[PDB]
Amino acid sequence: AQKFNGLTVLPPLLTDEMIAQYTSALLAGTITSGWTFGAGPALQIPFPMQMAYRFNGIGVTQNVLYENQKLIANQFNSAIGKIQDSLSSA
Amino acid sequence: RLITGRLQSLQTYVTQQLIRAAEIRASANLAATKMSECVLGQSKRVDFCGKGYHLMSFPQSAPHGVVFLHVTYVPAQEKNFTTAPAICHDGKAHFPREGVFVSNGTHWFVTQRNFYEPQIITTDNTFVSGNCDVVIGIVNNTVYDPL
Amino acid sequence: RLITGRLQSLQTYVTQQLIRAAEIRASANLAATKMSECVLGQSKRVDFCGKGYHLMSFPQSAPHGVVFLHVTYVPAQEKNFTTAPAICHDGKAHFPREGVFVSNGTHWFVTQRNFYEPQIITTDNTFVSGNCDVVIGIVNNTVYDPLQPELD
Amino acid sequence: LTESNKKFLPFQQFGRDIADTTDAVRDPQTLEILDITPCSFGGVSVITPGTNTSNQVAVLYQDVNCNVFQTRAGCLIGAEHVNNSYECDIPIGAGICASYQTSQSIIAYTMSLGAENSVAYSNNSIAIPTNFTISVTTEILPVSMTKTSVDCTMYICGDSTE
Amino acid sequence: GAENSVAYSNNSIAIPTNFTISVTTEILPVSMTKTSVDCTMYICGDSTECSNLLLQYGSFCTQLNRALTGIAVEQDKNTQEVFAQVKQIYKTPPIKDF
Numbered sequence: 001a002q003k004f005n006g007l008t009v010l011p012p013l014l015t016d017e018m019i020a021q022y023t024s025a026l027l028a029g030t031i032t033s034g035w036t037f038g039a040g041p042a043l044q045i046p047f048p049m050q051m052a053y054r055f056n057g058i059g060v061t062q063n064v065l066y067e068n069q070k071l072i073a074n075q076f077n078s079a080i081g082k083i084q085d086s087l088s089s090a
Numbered sequence: 091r092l093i094t095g096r097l098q099s100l101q102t103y104v105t106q107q108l109i110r111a112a113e114i115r116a117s118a119n120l121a122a123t124k125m126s127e128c129v130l131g132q133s134k135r136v137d138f139c140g141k142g143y144h145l146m147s148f149p150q151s152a153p154h155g156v157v158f159l160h161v162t163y164v165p166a167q168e169k170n171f172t173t174a175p176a177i178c179h180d181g182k183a184h185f186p187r188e189g190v191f192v193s194n195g196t197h198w199f200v201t202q203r204n205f206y207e208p209q210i211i212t213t214d215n216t217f218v219s220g221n222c223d224v225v226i227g228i229v230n231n232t233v234y235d236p237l
Numbered sequence: 238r239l240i241t242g243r244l245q246s247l248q249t250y251v252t253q254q255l256i257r258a259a260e261i262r263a264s265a266n267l268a269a270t271k272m273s274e275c276v277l278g279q280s281k282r283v284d285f286c287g288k289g290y291h292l293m294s295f296p297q298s299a300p301h302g303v304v305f306l307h308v309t310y311v312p313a314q315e316k317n318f319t320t321a322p323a324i325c326h327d328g329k330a331h332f333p334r335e336g337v338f339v340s341n342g343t344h345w346f347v348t349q350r351n352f353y354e355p356q357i358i359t360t361d362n363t364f365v366s367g368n369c370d371v372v373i374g375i376v377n378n379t380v381y382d383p384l385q386p387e388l389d
Numbered sequence: 390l391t392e393s394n395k396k397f398l399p400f401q402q403f404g405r406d407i408a409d410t411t412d413a414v415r416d417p418q419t420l421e422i423l424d425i426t427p428c429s430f431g432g433v434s435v436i437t438p439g440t441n442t443s444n445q446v447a448v449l450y451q452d453v454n455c456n457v458f459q460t461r462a463g464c465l466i467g468a469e470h471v472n473n474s475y476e477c478d479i480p481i482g483a484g485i486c487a488s489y490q491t492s493q494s495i496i497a498y499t500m501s502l503g504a505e506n507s508v509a510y511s512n513n514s515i516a517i518p519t520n521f522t523i524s525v526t527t528e529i530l531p532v533s534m535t536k537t538s539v540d541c542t543m544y545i546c547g548d549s550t551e
Numbered sequence: 552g553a554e555n556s557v558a559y560s561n562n563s564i565a566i567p568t569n570f571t572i573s574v575t576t577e578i579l580p581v582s583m584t585k586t587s588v589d590c591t592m593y594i595c596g597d598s599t600e601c602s603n604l605l606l607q608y609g610s611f612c613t614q615l616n617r618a619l620t621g622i623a624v625e626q627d628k629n630t631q632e633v634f635a636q637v638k639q640i641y642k643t644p645p646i647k648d649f
């Protein structure tokens with residue numbers, strides 16, 4: 001170790017469990033409310049409607065999301081698997 | 091010995107002042123950016139000019155610093171509703187143009203994102219796109235066609 | 238002699254730690270701004286929350302740091318089309334409201350800019366402003382006028 | 390001198406570590422391996438409830454192992470640990486704070502990251518606001534401080550030419 | 552990079568007809584280990600004579616201790632503005648049908 005010569009290390013104020021809890025709470029807020037919880041009280045919203053709102057934000061009509069919703073969901077799942085697999089491979 | 095000691099004392103103060111000046115420069119750059127965005131216009135950056143939907147900020151003079159009196163827009167009271175992403179009328183799917191399909195139990199309306207104001211679904215606030223055999227979730231209704 | 242030697246090493250270590258702490262503060266401020274914008278909503282800043290049109294991001298806990306799983310919107314397949322800025326019908330100039338005029342070989346349609354979806358050019362998706370002589374690259378066409386079959 | 394679990398060569402009779410410190414030595418009385426660990430040391434810390442609130446203080450140790458509660462950030466004395474959790478005001482470290490709460494005495498507890506609330510999620514349910522409140526948020530940002538000038542000739546030297 | 556030429560014309564456009572959802576990874580550190588170093592244990596050992604010459608450098612020792620304490624407080628604060636953006640925790644719904 002590096003503590004035998006008087007170089008004591010301060011433990012962090014926030015333990016890793018509490019950081020994980022904060023990240024999980026933020027993830028739940030961003031999948032169940034979108035941006036309403038980040039600018040006030042949390043407002044419930046379905047995830048496809050949040051995706052359609054983001055599609056309208058980037059300049060695309062919302063009907064193209066519902067026309068191929070299964071394709072977009074499969075692409076998102078494949079992307080999640082891809083980032084997990086590439087992360088597992090520093 | 092006295093000269094060496096005083097020079098050693100005089101260098102650490104200079105280093106600390108340089109670090110503090112760098113921190114002050116970074117804070118001043120952040121404050122100038124916040125001034126130019128939130129005060130000199132309306133900033134679309136969420137949670138940058140305060141918690142909530144920023145509208146304007148009022149700068150005030152402070153001793154060796156600055157403060158910003160941001161004006162934010164937060165909701166207070168909310169109500170739960172049953173929603174549908176699309177509506178089929180007769181072989182045609184109606185999507186809201188600048189609204190959302192909300193229901194109170196036996197009727198349907200159209201309302202905005204950050205405020206509640208019901209209206210009547212018609213051919214002016216909705217646009218047609220394809221059939222209703224592609225949308226996963228749809229609810230039957232009718233439009234007005236005011237002409 | 239030993240203590241005068243050790244003071245210099247301690248001071249150098251303190252200055253290095255202060256520089257590292259300043260860099261850590263800058264990185265933490267950048268991470269906090271990214272968390273406030275890309276995670277806590279949708280950020281309109283292009284090439285700030287990843288390459289492409291930003292949709293959302295998923296923050297995850299990291300040892301002595303943070304990571305962001307940004308969700309972007311990048312197109313894959315593109316096509317070629319012949320476009321016109323304005324269309325002349327009856328001595329009037331029609332401009333697209335929320336679209337762009339495109340023709341494949343003989344028929345002109347109005348589609349959104351970020352996705353391909355051809356639609357028939359009517360009076361609802363175009364607005365009349367001016368005459369035919371002002372526009373340089375104007376193209377003759379006919380406007381559907383959906384009111385005409387309905388009023389009959 | 391703790392009892393070690395690692396054996397050594399038959400002639401060396403000492404030990405070292407990665408940091409190049411003699412932390413092991415055989416005892417040639419009976420050829421027994423013994424570790425060397427530095428003695429306990431640290432600094433005391435004082436938890437103060439505040440001015441015009443209380444008078445009693447608590448004594449906190451950083452890394453010294455031991456009314457008396459053994460925390461993960463050392464040894465805490467003078468503060469009674471309580472299982473329930475509130476929002477803390479005086480940081481300590483390792484996930485536990487200290488506060489003055491009901492007579493009334495100083496207590497130590499795990500922090501609460503927020504109000505435990507679960508939002509209702511459904512595929513056909515939303516929450517559209519019907520009213521709003523105009524709120525003003527205050528932010529403080531310093532832009533400068535005092536400008537000082539330092540010259541050696543008057544500082545390191547007085548009124549002597551040497 | 553790749554040497555390519557993009558065709559430009561005054562009456563030619565290219566609009567997309569398909570899109571792919573991609574995930575971008577960004578690593579941003581926010582804090583590190585916090586260390587407190589004092590002159591009594593590092594510079595001196597168990598001798599009084601070393602401390603008898605340390606009263607002439609107690610001022611620099613105070614400066615270093617204050618700098619290290621400020622660094623530790625700054626690092627403890629740095630976690631607060633990135634992860635504690637909301638004061639309400641949100642439990643995930645038991646329904647995973649998104």
Ligand SMILES: *[C@@H]1O[C@H](CO)[C@@H](O[C@@H]2O[C@H](CO)[C@@H](O)[C@H](O)[C@H]2NC(C)=O)[C@H](O)[C@H]1NC(C)=O
Pocket residue numbers: 194195196197
């Ligand atoms: C749901 O909304 C509809 C439309 O606003 C309500 O129907 C009207 O209710 C008012 C209130 O008494 C009546 O005066 C109208 O005659 C109703 N119109 C129709 C076409 O029915 C309905 O009452 C609402 N239901 C609930 C439970 O709020």
Ligand SMILES: *[C@@H]1O[C@H](CO)[C@@H](O[C@@H]2O[C@H](CO)[C@@H](O)[C@H](O)[C@H]2NC(C)=O)[C@H](O)[C@H]1NC(C)=O
Pocket residue numbers: 230
């Ligand atoms: C919504 O309307 C559609 C069509 O108007 C309904 O679909 C019909 O359903 C009946 C029996 O449920 C069938 O006999 C018809 O052949 C269907 N027609 C078509 C065009 O699909 C649908 O049932 C309605 N939904 C609800 C909930 O009433």
Ligand SMILES: *[C@@H]1O[C@H](CO)[C@@H](O[C@@H]2O[C@H](CO)[C@@H](O)[C@H](O)[C@H]2NC(C)=O)[C@H](O)[C@H]1NC(C)=O
Pocket residue numbers: 341342343344
């Ligand atoms: C350009 O697009 C239009 C519309 O998609 C095409 O017109 C259709 O062509 C098909 C193919 O024979 C016919 O069955 C339809 O009746 C046509 N529709 C109309 C309204 O005329 C047109 O053929 C395309 N041109 C080229 C060169 O691809």
Ligand SMILES: *[C@@H]1O[C@H](CO)[C@@H](O[C@@H]2O[C@H](CO)[C@@H](O)[C@H](O)[C@H]2NC(C)=O)[C@H](O)[C@H]1NC(C)=O
Pocket residue numbers: 377
């Ligand atoms: C677009 O239409 C206009 C009018 O319908 C055309 O202008 C006519 O051009 C002919 C010969 O080019 C002249 O004899 C007429 O006097 C013009 N009329 C007007 C009102 O200007 C124009 O040529 C057409 N453009 C194309 C490419 O066909």
Ligand SMILES: *[C@@H]1O[C@H](CO)[C@@H](O[C@@H]2O[C@H](CO)[C@@H](O)[C@H](O)[C@H]2NC(C)=O)[C@H](O)[C@H]1NC(C)=O
Pocket residue numbers: 166167519520521
């Ligand atoms: C929205 O909230 C405001 C703030 O509470 C409400 O204004 C109050 O209304 C009550 C009753 O109408 C009055 O007694 C208070 O004096 C009002 N306060 C202020 C500051 O104006 C308002 O009524 C709410 N609107 C709705 C539709 O609920």
Ligand SMILES: *[C@@H]1O[C@H](CO)[C@@H](O[C@@H]2O[C@H](CO)[C@@H](O)[C@H](O)[C@H]2NC(C)=O)[C@H](O)[C@H]1NC(C)=O
Pocket residue numbers: 071074075078313314568569570
């Ligand atoms: C847009 O790109 C996606 C991704 O490649 C296409 O989806 C693929 O479609 C083929 C044939 O339809 C399937 O064999 C693949 O399994 C699909 N991949 C995924 C990830 O779903 C989609 O067809 C493309 N759309 C267009 C109009 O070109």
Ligand SMILES: *[C@@H]1O[C@H](CO)[C@@H](O)[C@H](O)[C@H]1NC(C)=O
Pocket residue numbers: 168169170171509516
């Ligand atoms: C609306 O109703 C649902 C269940 O019926 C409930 O979970 C939710 O909290 C309600 N919303 C409000 C604002 O009361």
Ligand SMILES: *[C@@H]1O[C@H](CO)[C@@H](O)[C@H](O)[C@H]1NC(C)=O
Pocket residue numbers: 227512513648
């Ligand atoms: C919503 O989800 C529930 C649970 O899976 C399901 O029974 C219901 O049909 C869904 N409704 C729609 C409109 O998708």
Ligand SMILES: *[C@@H]1O[C@H](CO)[C@@H](O)[C@H](O)[C@H]1NC(C)=O
Pocket residue numbers: 316317558
């Ligand atoms: C098709 O697109 C390519 C893009 O490089 C372009 O060069 C070509 O001219 C287009 N075809 C026509 C007929 O314009």
Ligand SMILES: *[C@@H]1O[C@H](CO)[C@@H](O)[C@H](O)[C@H]1NC(C)=O
Pocket residue numbers: 373374561562
């Ligand atoms: C485009 O440019 C070419 C070459 O300068 C020219 O011949 C043609 O008329 C132009 N077309 C338009 C619509 O400006």
Ligand SMILES: *[C@@H]1O[C@H](CO)[C@@H](O)[C@H](O)[C@H]1NC(C)=O
Pocket residue numbers: 454455
């Ligand atoms: C502290 O000392 C006691 C007795 O000496 C011992 O039981 C306890 O395990 C020690 N704590 C740690 C963390 O080792």
Ligand SMILES: *[C@@H]1O[C@H](CO)[C@@H](O)[C@H](O)[C@H]1NC(C)=O
Pocket residue numbers: 470471472473
């Ligand atoms: C707090 O409650 C838990 C519940 O099991 C108990 O184990 C613990 O002893 C309590 N703490 C104190 C200080 O009484």
